Design a protein around this ligand. Structure first.
Ligand SMILES: O=C(NO)c1ccc(Cn2nnnc2-c2cccs2)cc1
Ligand SMILES: [K+]
Ligand SMILES: [K+]
Ligand SMILES: [Zn+2]
Length: 357
């Protein structure tokens, strides 16, 4: 296919001024981008310009209060930045954080626009800070604004409010914010795979369990695939895609696919403890390309091992460009708790999705 790419070095300015070893490093996006040059993927992509989201566009999903408080950080002394971030769960703030969050969202809006107007079929967004933990009313988990959810609402806003958007969240953490923003919405299908461990894994809410299926009109349009019992990898993700993600996505018949593409389920990630390989990621991308006549935007969320994320996101771009997926030969048998996880999601969603029955 013809594949868009958006990257802006300005998104590197957002930094932890008290702890420069904090995993959500500026060089996350510079290394992913560099590795795209090194693999010469960049020359095969249509460069989409970055841009600031407007406060009007942020309001697609966030309150005035929340937009206003994060905007006020631009002009704070360090001791005020420190104390503002302590108001949230796992948030650091610098004078540049607002601008960077704006850049992450605008980059994704331009990418959605390039896709939906037919300038490209598919696109990768190399952006930070991440979005999926951000709520309507609060920052959380290194996230200021819900980039993915905003892009889903911005896409509906420049096309039609009916546009069926599938958000696949394969970041190792639950997109608490993405689930809540669309919980009562049957126009946005939210599928998250995430390490859960009975509430022990961040963000530590029962909201990420398989029995949270959506509310009212949204009942069945929220699919949590929670992993328990530690390490997971290619076999579990390939099994989850086959029995759940792809059957539900096919029934839903999305007109656009957003991937909340965290690479913290990657082998080597210090915060995920999982073993998804770049080849694994290449297979999940290729499978998603089978939907929405290939209309797929891949948006960076988390992922904290600089090699793993650079190798993993490059393999995804490579797939969007139409390259042949690496053999995933000799996959081991599934972990048991992963069979149980998949079967718990089937029992929860069979009532809503004939393709699972
Ligand atoms: O966005 C995230 N992943 O993609 C994310 C968000 C928040 C957390 C919180 N946490 N939990 N345990 N250690 C931590 C750390 C806090 C600061 C450095 S480590 C982990 C991960
Ligand atoms: K997830
Ligand atoms: K939903
Ligand atoms: Zn994560």
């Amino acid at each position: 296919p013809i594949t868009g790419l958006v990257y802006d070095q300005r998104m590197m300015l957002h930094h932890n001024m008290w702890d420069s070893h904090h995993p959500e490093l500026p060089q996350r996006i510079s290394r992913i981008f560099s590795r795209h040059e090194e693999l010469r993927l960049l020359s095969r992509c249509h460069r989409i310009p970055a841009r600031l989201a407007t406060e009007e566009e942020l309001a697609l999903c966030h309150s005035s209060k929340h937009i206003s408080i994060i905007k006020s950080s631009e002009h704070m002394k360090p001791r005020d930045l420190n104390r503002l971030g302590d108001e949230y769960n796992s948030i650091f703030i610098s004078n540049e954080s607002y601008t960077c969050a704006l850049l992450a969202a605008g980059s994704c809006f331009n990418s959605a626009q390039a896709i939906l107007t037919g300038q490209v079929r598919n696109a990768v967004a190399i952006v930070r800070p991440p979005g999926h933990h951000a709520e309507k009313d609060t920052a959380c988990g290194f996230c200021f604004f819900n980039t993915a959810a905003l892009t889903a609402r911005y896409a509906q806003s420049i096309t039609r409010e009916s546009l069926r958007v599938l958000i696949v969240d394969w970041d190792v953490h639950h997109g608490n914010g993405t689930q809540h923003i669309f919980e009562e919405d049957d126009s946005v299908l939210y599928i998250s795979l995430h390490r859960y461990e009975d509430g022990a894994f961040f963000p530590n809410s029962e909201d990420a369990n398989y029995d949270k299926v959506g509310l009212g009109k949204g009942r069945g349009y929220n699919v949590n695939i929670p992993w328990n019992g530690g390490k997971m990898g290619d076999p579990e993700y390939m099994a989850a895609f086959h029995h759940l993600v792809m059957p539900i996505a096919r029934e839903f018949a999305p007109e656009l696919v957003l991937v909340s593409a965290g690479f913290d389920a990657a082998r080597g990630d210090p915060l995920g403890g999982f073993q998804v390989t770049p080849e694994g990621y290449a297979h999940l991308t290729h499978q998603l390309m089978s939907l929405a006549a290939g209309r797929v935007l891949i948006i960076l969320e988390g992922g904290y091992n600089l090699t793993s994320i650079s190798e993993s996101m490059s393999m995804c771009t490579s797939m969007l460009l139409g390259d042949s997926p690496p053999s995933l030969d000799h996959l081991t048998p599934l972990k048991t708790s992963a069979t149980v996880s998949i079967n718990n999601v089937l029992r929860a969603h069979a009532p809503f999705w004939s393709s699972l029955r």
